[PDB]
Design a protein around this ligand. Structure first.
Ligand code: NA
Length: 58
């Protein structure tokens, strides 16, 4: 399973991050060893977001 929803709006100016809106669904494509960031896919493309800003959806 790799479906999640954003807990909060997240928007960074940092290159290679993805902006997400609270309530938006996303899928996780890649993780990191420490689990703090993950590469997400939404209708707006792909990029990295903080893992603590998302939560799974069955
Ligand atoms: Na995090």
């Amino acid at each position: 399973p790799n479906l999640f929803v954003a807990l909060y709006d997240f928007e960074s100016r940092t290159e290679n991050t993805l902006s997400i809106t609270k309530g938006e669904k996303l899928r996780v494509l890649n993780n990191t060893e420490n689990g703090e960031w993950c590469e997400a896919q939404t209708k707006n493309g792909q990029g990295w977001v903080p893992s603590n800003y998302i939560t799974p959806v069955n």
